[PDB]
Symmetry: C2
Subunit: 245 residues, 2 copies
């Protein structure tokens, strides 16, 4: 084999100058984009500036795509394709939390994205309550089955397990916690899509990944990379990319 995948998620963050020096530091890292996918997801209005500054070895995407007639104010899949935006994030915590986004919404967003030839980074994960109450696999299973059957090309949809309690909190899942879930996610894909598809699909962990914990996470057999928020705002993010090289 699987090609590893490391994503930066710049959430509501950045100035033109901070992006300039950050992208400069990222550009200083030699890696081979045929061997490793590295994707940056800036704020919408930072997209063009970020794409201008990042060297071609980096891919770029946007943090959301819309599902109509009544304009919700979100960027459509059609608009993203026309702009040659390669990737979209779907199902990220803030969409589900603050904007009532359902599993059915995730399904339709995935449909719209693939219809429009976008690659999708699809996120899911359980709350702290749901884990404490032994419901994590139940939760993940329903979340993943909400959309996984739509997948056509298993290089073009990337799954991200991000338990809600690890996102932005500093409280990273242990490697074994993450691996346990990734094993089960890959089984759901095997049972629904096929053995070859499951062995091909990338399943990433996100939730307070940093330079100290990334090596032990990526070492796990079914963890294929990361979605990285807070630590991707730092120049040391290049060391997290290195852990997947």
């Amino acid at each position: 084999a699987r090609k590893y995948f490391v994503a930066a998620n710049w959430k509501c963050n950045g100035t033109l100058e901070s992006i300039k020096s950050l992208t400069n530091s990222f550009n200083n890292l030699d890696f081979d984009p045929s061997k490793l996918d590295v994707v940056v997801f800036p704020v919408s209005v930072h997209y063009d500036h970020t794409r201008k500054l990042l060297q071609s070895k980096f891919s770029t995407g946007i943090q959301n795509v819309s599902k109509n007639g009544s304009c919700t104010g979100e960027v459509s899949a059609e608009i993203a394709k026309d702009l040659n935006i390669e990737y979209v994030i779907i199902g990220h915590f803030e969409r589900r939390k603050y904007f009532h986004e359902t599993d059915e919404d995730v399904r339709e967003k995935l449909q719209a994205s693939l219809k429009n030839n976008l690659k999708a980074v699809v996120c899911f994960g359980e709350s702290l309550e749901q884990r404490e109450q032994n419901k994590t696999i139940e939760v993940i299973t329903k979340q993943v089955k909400a959309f996984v059957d739509l997948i056509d090309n298993f290089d073009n949809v990337i799954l991200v397990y991000e338990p809600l309690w690890a996102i932005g909190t500093g409280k990273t899942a242990t490697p074994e916690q993450a691996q346990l879930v990734h094993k089960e996610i890959r089984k759901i894909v095997k049972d629904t899509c096929g053995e070859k598809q499951a062995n091909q699909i990338r399943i990433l962990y996100g939730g307070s990944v940093n330079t100290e914990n990334c090596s032990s996470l990526i070492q796990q057999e079914d963890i294929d990379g990361f979605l990285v928020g807070n630590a991707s705002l730092k120049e040391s993010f290049v060391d997290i990319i290195k852990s997947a090289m």
Copy 2:
């Protein structure tokens, strides 16, 4: 005086090519930006392309700004200022409708925008039920008082009356319907902010403005321009600008 103000609102609409030919047609119109404000509000990811293509006589803005710690995925006022985005829209129908945005949210967005030296286009209006049930002035009054006291510079906040039943529907308010409301809105500003401030502030109508109805709307004493959705997607939008010249 009062300087007139005509705004284009491109809601979830456009390709790079359609923006290219549309902006070209807009650029062909001679007007004096010291005498007339003309502002285009593109989709977020179209902002830089649209700003590149539009001549300096046109101002530009974005369709929303965020109110935290937990990133909602919206563009912040700080980010907009850093990008030298001149204007923001606040309280537009789709924010209130599809995203539960309250009068209190509008107030805080206006606060954040002014704190960050943004000019604000603040929208409000009653539903069809509320009008049919004789509640329009009541509704408008509460909406406007939710924020109007925060206004400091009365060139820099622009009020937009857009009755919800006229937005995107083809069902334009008559000039007298609109004027009745604008008179009352200007009185609210007089009573809360002062006689000079009220005579200075721009109060625009929006809701299916087009080339056939704009002249009779703008002719009304307290209507100072327009927020234009559907008709601003056409090259004939230049004739709506002309009606305010």
